Amino acid sequence: KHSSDICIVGAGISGLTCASHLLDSPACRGLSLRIFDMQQEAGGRIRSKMLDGKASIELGAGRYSPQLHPHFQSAMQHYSQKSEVYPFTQLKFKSHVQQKLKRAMNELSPRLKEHGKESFLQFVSRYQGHDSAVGMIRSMGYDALFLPDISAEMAYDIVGKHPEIQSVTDNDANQWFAAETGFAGLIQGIKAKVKAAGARFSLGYRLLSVRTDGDGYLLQLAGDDGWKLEHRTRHLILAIPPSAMAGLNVDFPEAWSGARYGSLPLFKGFLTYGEPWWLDYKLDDQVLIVDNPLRKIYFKGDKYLFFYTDSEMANYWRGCVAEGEDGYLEQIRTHLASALGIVRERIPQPLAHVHKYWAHGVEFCRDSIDHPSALSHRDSGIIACSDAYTEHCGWMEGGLLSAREASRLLLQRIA
Amino acid sequence: KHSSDICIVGAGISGLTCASHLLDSPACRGLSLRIFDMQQEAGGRIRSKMLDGKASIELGAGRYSPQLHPHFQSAMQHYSQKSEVYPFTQLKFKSHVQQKLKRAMNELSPRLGKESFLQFVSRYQGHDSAVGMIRSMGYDALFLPDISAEMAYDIVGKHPEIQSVTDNDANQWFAAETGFAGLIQGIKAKVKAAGARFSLGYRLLSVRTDGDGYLLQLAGDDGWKLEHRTRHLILAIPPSAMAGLNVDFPEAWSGARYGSLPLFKGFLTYGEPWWLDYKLDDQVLIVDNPLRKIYFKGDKYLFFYTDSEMANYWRGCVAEGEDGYLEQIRTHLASALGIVRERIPQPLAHVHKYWAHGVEFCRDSDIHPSALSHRDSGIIACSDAYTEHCGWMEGGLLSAREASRLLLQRIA
Ligand SMILES: Cc1cc2nc3c(=O)[nH]c(=O)nc-3n(C[C@H](O)[C@H](O)[C@H](O)COP(=O)(O)OP(=O)(O)OC[C@H]3O[C@@H](n4cnc5c(N)ncnc54)[C@H](O)[C@@H]3O)c2cc1C
Ligand SMILES: Cc1cc2nc3c(=O)[nH]c(=O)nc-3n(C[C@H](O)[C@H](O)[C@H](O)COP(=O)(O)OP(=O)(O)OC[C@H]3O[C@@H](n4cnc5c(N)ncnc54)[C@H](O)[C@@H]3O)c2cc1C
Ligand SMILES: [Cl-]
Ligand SMILES: [Cl-]
């Protein structure tokens, strides 16, 4: 036996793109390439489903901007994937609370040269105190902004990149699209191309440890039916995120970067009904940001509705799922009712629903000193590859950037 | 608050039947009952699938006998599950060694034994000749040293394909018509309607005694850490999963020692039933080559079933690539029927399943209780591996009666 020239652990968008660059290179003519992923389907945090077979939903990544994510758009085009307009870029009720924050973030703006290391909360509290800063930050519907490990300078960035709140900063001309059939369509297209150029996949295997071994490396993997397996290879990319790196045999992060990394969890839930009852309220294609636990509420045409939350509120919803389905559904009815200013009895019960919880939905770096796109083990020559090593940490575009640099460091290992 | 009065970990046939007996009991009125299992669906080593919209298949347990398993045959009827005749009760195309096989088994049966069946069967016959005839029976457990020659005659006599090699050719074999999934769903529906709550997809990592009750660590299959407090606790899991836990198994439970061996099944559907041309439907061939047992089910499909070292052989091919695995099957099919490879079609669809611990058993003649109790904490462990019927669903039912009785005791 079980052996290869090059091995990529991780069949997310980073690892699949790594494989695509390598196989396009003359200097790999004739080499063998093996790809492992601990899951049954490629994709990582890209996961499309069919909700009640009536419409495609995105349990993971769902949106991209041509302004922010041009390599991603070019990937969509190269693989003939249809894009559709993403509507949730405005509010039917931008509150004065929001436009106050627009006015207070621009007012406060010329201070981040000196103070931008402070937490975003500690920052905004300098305008109209702290109770007013909480009401303003909370109206943006992304509870990660309260975390002390989120600085003020990196908060202004977060706000400008997300489509619901991007007009609070002068980043409002950006456009947004979604895959018309599901982002899994792109994943399958790259996967087919890499397979047809001779790669071989072993989906369902988890890497456990790795030891350097002469000129190559010996990897210990475990199948999800318990079958133990050993693989030998001469060149190794780990296209996994930092949290998974930290639980391996290598010296991460000390011997790799120096910097420290964190992560926050994400939760999304979708509900279908027999009738599109929100059309009477003129809510199709709209998004509401509320202070109750659903945080962001989305109505998608005829088709369905969903909510999307993060950090402490993600953990809240996943506790309800653990206390039982009825009750989870029933607290959605309560909070939907108050978001619309009506009584629980006007909100029907769903036919079918789906949810997903990501223990490490988004992983980021906690510095910047100039951090490179992909990393290299100080001692063994293993290469790491993650969205979390780029300026686009938290976005698919970040995966494609790190893949290009990572696949270039390994090309020079090969000459 | 995340807690219960009673907790059962394991939603195989043992765990669900444990829950079924408890909710039937008057002494459990008022009390709360929570069932965990690490899989997303219930049934353990019972697993029914649909290969092609055509037919349902058994990735795990597939057959029972009314004579050998009266309680299982009774569960089927208590839940109104239709049965069907299991055809693979006869080796219609015997090989030379089959004929000698009945004769030597009745011939060696005097010798009192408890020794490894390979060394024994080669005591009164040539060693290279014993390998020839043991292997004609199609189950490579029979070559393991950890299996006595006593154990081996009990194995030959209870499997539908070689039972006529003993004076047991008169047992009947049945399969489920819609799959044993239908028996699992029946018990699950009952236990849920009496008010039990399922947390499927959670895996128990450890357990700690805590005052009068116990405190459980669980991990969801998406990472969510969980803690559950209960007062009474059944662990309806096999020994191999007892060993990976917080508790001192087996040292502090039985003082016996247990083993296991792995199993593999593979199913193939085609465009046209090419095997009828050989008068081969509803028939089973035992061959020497890696497929070890080849079954032909009417028009619908063929499969193969192997154990122990051959089970690892096939799981190996799978890890080297789906293609070529299919080509191994196609080479070995050709030698089994004695034709060239190019006459054997490739299949439309196929499914396989590998069971790292397919069957687990006890290594002793400890005249083995049906369920166990932890000397100190009062935790009860439930498994087919503790009974005379280990490796059979009937043992899960028997271990369940006992485990729920030891618990109903302690509740008063
Ligand atoms: C809720 C949510 C919403 C999102 N929304 C957006 C959005 O709208 N726009 C956008 O651009 N991005 C979004 N993202 C991010 C997007 O999912 C990208 O894929 C992500 O930024 C990085 O992809 P990746 O290939 O680097 O890593 P991953 O997709 O995380 O892939 C890593 C893979 O390696 C595998 N793996 C890990 N560890 C091991 C091991 N020890 N052995 C073997 N195999 C292993 C994993 O199974 C995984 O498949 C969202 C993410 C989440 C969770
Ligand atoms: C290939 C194969 C063929 C078979 N053919 C037959 C046959 O024809 N006739 C027959 O009678 N029997 C057959 N069997 C055996 C039959 O499947 C078993 O005897 C019976 O199902 C065992 O029931 P059980 O509840 O004791 O254990 P299991 O079926 O093993 O259920 C145990 C459950 O505990 C769960 N679990 C384990 N550990 C943990 C943990 N730490 N946390 C949470 N949950 C946990 C598991 O997910 C599992 O669901 C076959 C088995 C195999 C593998
Ligand atoms: Cl996002
Ligand atoms: Cl069996």
HEC readout, A250-295 = CCCCCCCCCCCEEEEEEEEEEEECCCCHHHCCCCCCEEEECCCCCC
A65 residue type, one letter: S
A131 residue type, one letter: D
Query: Measured from the CB, is residue B218 less than 6 Å from ligand 2?
Result: no
| Contact flag B222-A358 (C-beta cutoff 8 Å) | yes
A407 residue type, one letter: S
Phi, psi of B256 (to 5 degrees): -80, 180
Phi, psi of B139 (to 5 degrees): -120, 110
Q: Does B40 touch chain A (CB under 8 A)?
A: no
Nearest CA in chain B to A314: B224
Show the tokens assigned to B271. 């465009």
Show the tokens assigned to A196. 């047809």
Q: Which of A32, A195, A227 to mutate to test the interface with B (most CBs of B within 10 A)?
A: A227
Cα–Cα distances in angstroms (integers) from residue B312 to residues B260, B290, B353, in the given order: 13, 11, 12
Query: Measured from the CB, is residue A240 less than 6 Å from ligand 1?
Result: yes
Phi, psi of A394 (to 5 degrees): 90, 10
Cα–Cα distances in angstroms (integers) from residue A237 to residues A193, A197, A210, in the given order: 19, 18, 12
Separation between Cα atoms, residue A157 and residue B129, nearest integer Å: 78
Separation between Cα atoms, residue A60 and residue A357, nearest integer Å: 9
Q: Are A304 and A315 in contact (CB under 8 A)?
A: no
Show the tokens assigned to B90. 């006869």
CA nearest B214: which of B227, B196, B191, B230? Answer: B230
Q: Are A78 and A291 in contact (CB under 8 A)?
A: no
Q: How far is CA B410 from the centre of its chain?
A: 30
Which DSSP symbol is given to B75?
H
3-state SS, residue B350: strand
Separation between Cα atoms, residue A237 and residue A406, nearest integer Å: 8
Q: Does A322 touch chain B (CB under 8 A)?
A: yes
| Contact flag A202-B319 (C-beta cutoff 8 Å) | yes
Q: Are A262 and A149 in contact (CB under 8 A)?
A: yes
Query: Measured from the CB, is residue A16 less than 6 Å from ligand 1?
Result: no
| Contact flag A223-B199 (C-beta cutoff 8 Å) | no
Separation between Cα atoms, residue B149 and residue B115, nearest integer Å: 5
Q: What is the number of the ligand closest to the CA of A176?
A: 1
Cα–Cα distances in angstroms (integers) from residue A275 to residues A278, A304, A351, in the given order: 9, 10, 10
Q: Are A387 and A239 in contact (CB under 8 A)?
A: no
Cα–Cα distances in angstroms (integers) from residue B238 to residues A216, B141, B381, B397, in the given order: 40, 19, 8, 13
Which residue's CA is the closest to the ligand 1 atom numbered 36?
A10
> Whose structure tokens read 């509401």?
A288
Q: Does B2 touch chain A (CB under 8 A)?
A: yes
Query: Measured from the CB, is residue A36 less than 6 Å from ligand 1?
Result: yes
Q: Are B357 and B240 in contact (CB under 8 A)?
A: yes
Separation between Cα atoms, residue A162 and residue B312, nearest integer Å: 51
Alpha helices, DSSP H, located in A139-198: 153-161, 184-196
Separation between Cα atoms, residue B359 and residue B146, nearest integer Å: 14
Query: Measured from the CB, is residue A398 less than 6 Å from ligand 1?
Result: yes
Find the helix or strand (DSSP H, E) in which B181 lies: helix B181-193
Separation between Cα atoms, residue B241 and residue B125, nearest integer Å: 40
Q: Which of A205, A225, A243, A325 to mutate to test the interface with B (most CBs of B within 10 A)?
A: A225
Q: Does A317 touch chain B (CB under 8 A)?
A: no
Show the tokens assigned to A64. 């991209």
Within the 255-314 window of chain A, which residues sit less than 8 Å (CB to CB) from chain B? none
B383 residue type, one letter: S
Residues 6+ positions from A321 with CB-CB distance below 8 Å = A328, A355, A357
Residues 6+ positions from A219 with CB-CB distance below 8 Å = A7, A9, A207, A209, A210, A230, A231, A232, A233, A236
Question: Would you call the peptide bond into A110 cis, given omega within 30 degrees of 0 as the criterion?
Answer: no
The atom number, within ligand 2, closest to the CA of B39 reads 47
Which residues in chain B touch residue A356, judged by CB atoms under 8 angstroms apart? Answer: 222
Separation between Cα atoms, residue B45 and residue B192, nearest integer Å: 21
- The CA A44 to ligand 1 mean position distance, Å, reads 4
Query: Measured from the CB, is residue A39 less than 6 Å from ligand 1?
Result: yes
What's the number of CA atoms in the CB half-sphere (13 Å) around residue B247? 32
Nearest CA in chain A to B357: A226
Question: Count of A–B CB contacts within 8 Å?
Answer: 35
> Whose structure tokens read 């490796």?
B391
Show the tokens assigned to B282. 């509803």
Which residues in chain B touch residue A223, judged by CB atoms under 8 angstroms apart? Answer: 319
CA nearest B403: which of B377, B384, B388? Answer: B384
Q: What is the number of the ligand closest to the CA of A310?
A: 1
Query: Measured from the CB, is residue B46 less than 6 Å from ligand 2?
Result: yes
Orientation angle between helical segments A184-196 and A70-78, nearest 10 degrees = 60
Query: Measured from the CB, is residue B12 less than 6 Å from ligand 2?
Result: yes
What is the widest separation between alpha-carbon atoms in chain B? 70
Alpha helices, DSSP H, located in A305-395: 312-323, 325-339
Q: Are A96 and A88 in contact (CB under 8 A)?
A: no
> Whose structure tokens read 């009496």?
B194
Which DSSP symbol is given to B28?
G
The atom number, within ligand 2, closest to the CA of B305 reads 1
CA nearest A39: which of A6, A61, A9? Answer: A9
CB nearest to A227's CB, from B197, B321, B354: B354
Q: Are B293 and B304 in contact (CB under 8 A)?
A: yes
CB nearest to A225's CB, from B197, B223, B356: B356
Cα–Cα distances in angstroms (integers) from residue B189 to residues B26, B34, B42, B46, B346, in the given order: 20, 14, 11, 16, 41
Query: Measured from the CB, is residue B138 less than 6 Å from ligand 2?
Result: no
Show the tokens assigned to A373. 């796109």
Q: How far is A39 from chain B (nearest CA, A)?
A: 12
Separation between Cα atoms, residue B186 and residue B78, nearest integer Å: 10
Which DSSP symbol is given to B321?
-
Query: Measured from the CB, is residue A386 less than 6 Å from ligand 1?
Result: yes
Show the tokens assigned to B395. 């043992």
CB nearest to A322's CB, from B223, B224, B315: B224
Separation between Cα atoms, residue B303 and residue A254, nearest integer Å: 52
Show the tokens assigned to B145. 């040293």
CA nearest B271: which of B299, B304, B305? Answer: B299
A324 residue type, one letter: G
The atom number, within ligand 1, closest to the CA of A10 reads 34
Q: Are A38 and A162 in contact (CB under 8 A)?
A: no
Phi, psi of B157 (to 5 degrees): -75, -15
Q: What is the CA radius of gyration of chain B?
A: 23
Q: Give the annotated binding-site residues of B for FAD.
A: 14, 37, 45, 63, 204, 393
Q: Are B60 and B353 in contact (CB under 8 A)?
A: yes
Q: How far is A33 from chain B (nearest CA, A)?
A: 13
Give the length of chain B: 412
CB nearest to A227's CB, from B220, B224, B315: B315
Separation between Cα atoms, residue B330 and residue B345, nearest integer Å: 8
| Contact flag B355-A225 (C-beta cutoff 8 Å) | yes
Cα–Cα distances in angstroms (integers) from residue B60 to residues B50, B51, B179, in the given order: 13, 14, 11
Please list the residues that pair with B206 across neighbouring strands: B217
Reading phi first (left if > 0) and then psi (alpha if -120 to 50, else beta), residue A42 is in beta
What's the number of CA atoms in the CB half-sphere (13 Å) around residue A8? 30
Query: Measured from the CB, is residue B383 less than 6 Å from ligand 2?
Result: yes
Reading phi first (left if > 0) and then psi (alpha if -120 to 50, else beta), residue B401 is in alpha
Q: What is the number of the ligand closest to the CA of B184?
A: 2
B359 residue type, one letter: V
Query: Measured from the CB, is residue B384 less than 6 Å from ligand 2?
Result: yes
Cα–Cα distances in angstroms (integers) from residue B80 to residues B41, B69, B176, B178, B226, in the given order: 21, 17, 11, 12, 37
Q: How far is A355 from chain B (nearest CA, A)?
A: 12
Q: Which of B45, B48, B200, B295 to mutate to test ligand 2, by most ligand atoms within 8 A of the CB atom?
A: B45
B189 residue type, one letter: A
Please list the residues that pair with A200 across neighbouring strands: A34
Q: Are B23 and B206 in contact (CB under 8 A)?
A: no
| Angstrom resolution of this structure | 2.6
Please list the residues that pair with B303 across neighbouring strands: B267, B295
Residues 6+ positions from B337 with CB-CB distance below 8 Å = B278
CB nearest to A324's CB, from B197, B222, B356: B197
Strand pairing class (A228-238; A3-9): parallel
Which DSSP symbol is given to A151?
B
Please write down the long-range contacts of A280-283, taking CB distance under 8 Å and 24 or more positions apart: A281/A340, A282/A92, A283/A92
Q: Are A401 and A17 in contact (CB under 8 A)?
A: no
CB atoms within 10 A of CB B74: 12
Please list the residues that pair with A306 across neighbouring strands: A270, A298
Cα–Cα distances in angstroms (integers) from residue B78 to residues A23, B70, B81, in the given order: 60, 12, 8
Separation between Cα atoms, residue B152 and residue B117, nearest integer Å: 6
Separation between Cα atoms, residue B397 and residue B382, nearest integer Å: 10
Find the helix or strand (DSSP H, E) in which B322 lies: helix B322-337
Given strand A286-289, what is the order of strands in its sheet? A286-289, A296-300, A304-310, A261-272, A352-365
Separation between Cα atoms, residue A287 and residue B253, nearest integer Å: 58
Q: Are A14 and A401 in contact (CB under 8 A)?
A: no
Show the tokens assigned to A262. 């964190």
Residues 6+ positions from A255 with CB-CB distance below 8 Å = A377, A378, A379
What is the widest separation between alpha-carbon atoms in chain A? 70
Show the tokens assigned to A33. 């390439």
Within the 159-198 window of chain B, which residues sit less than 8 Å (CB to CB) from chain A? 197
Reading phi first (left if > 0) and then psi (alpha if -120 to 50, else beta), residue A201 is in beta
Which residues in chain A touch residue B222, judged by CB atoms under 8 angstroms apart? Answer: 356-359
Give the length of chain A: 415
Separation between Cα atoms, residue B331 and residue B345, nearest integer Å: 11
Please list the residues that pair with B354 across neighbouring strands: B264
Separation between Cα atoms, residue B56 and residue B46, nearest integer Å: 13
CA nearest A401: which of A388, A382, A414, A383? Answer: A388
Separation between Cα atoms, residue B215 and residue B6, nearest integer Å: 12
Q: Which of A39, A41, A45 to mutate to test ligand 1, by most ligand atoms within 8 A of the CB atom?
A: A45
- The CA A174 to ligand 1 mean position distance, Å, reads 24
Find the helix or strand (DSSP H, E) in which B356 lies: strand B349-362
Separation between Cα atoms, residue B381 and residue B404, nearest integer Å: 10
Q: Are B296 and B275 in contact (CB under 8 A)?
A: yes
Separation between Cα atoms, residue B300 and residue A94, nearest integer Å: 62
Q: Are A383 and A237 in contact (CB under 8 A)?
A: yes
Q: Are A408 and A75 in contact (CB under 8 A)?
A: no
